[PDB]
Amino acid sequence: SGAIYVGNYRVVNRHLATHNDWANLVWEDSSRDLLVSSTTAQGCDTIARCDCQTGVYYCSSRRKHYPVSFSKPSLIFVEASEYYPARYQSHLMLAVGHSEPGDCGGILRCQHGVVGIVSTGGNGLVGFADVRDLLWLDEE
Numbered sequence: 001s002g003a004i005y006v007g008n009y010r011v012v013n014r015h016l017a018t019h020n021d022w023a024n025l026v027w028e029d030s031s032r033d034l035l036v037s038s039t040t041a042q043g044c045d046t047i048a049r050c051d052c053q054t055g056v057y058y059c060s061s062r063r064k065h066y067p068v069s070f071s072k073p074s075l076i077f078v079e080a081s082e083y084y085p086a087r088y089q090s091h092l093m094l095a096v097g098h099s100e101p102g103d104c105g106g107i108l109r110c111q112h113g114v115v116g117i118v119s120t121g122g123n124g125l126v127g128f129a130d131v132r133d134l135l136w137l138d139e140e
């Protein structure tokens with residue numbers, strides 16, 4: 001689990017979105033595993049605006065933050081998980097590292113701020129849904 005809190009937006013994995021998220025929907029995209037809902041309180045996070053390929057991510061199933069190198073966001077085949085069938089996921093970055101289903105929502109961060117959240121795992125990789133292209137998260 002986990003979210004990004006930027007402005008009056010809450011960014012969550014689409015598959016973990018609650019009824020309250022869907023009732024306060026701003027934007028969602030199944031292909032990216034993202035959903036954004038509106039918040040009452042302002043959040044603490046800053047979104048990275050950059051093309052970094054190095055950062056640090058939180059792994060709940062290890063209680064640890066790991067430094068990783070990661071691929072640029074691309075359209076990637078993802079094998080079946082407990083929460084999606086085998087399918088193509090867009091705007092996905094991969095790194096070598098540990099990820100289980102419950103790790104989804106952990107933040108990946110670089111020197112510029114939040115890059116994305118954990119969205120995929122298995123076979124010794126961790127996949128992250130990028131948010132750095134969602135420039136509208138920084139306004140309104």
Ligand SMILES: Fc1ccccc1CNC1CCOCC1
Nearest residue numbers: 002058060062063064065106107
């Ligand atoms: F790293 C740990 C070590 C022991 C217990 C718990 C943690 C994880 N701390 C969280 C805090 C909220 O943001 C994500 C990381």
Ligand SMILES: [Zn+2]
Nearest residue numbers: 050052110112
């Ligand atoms: Zn960066």
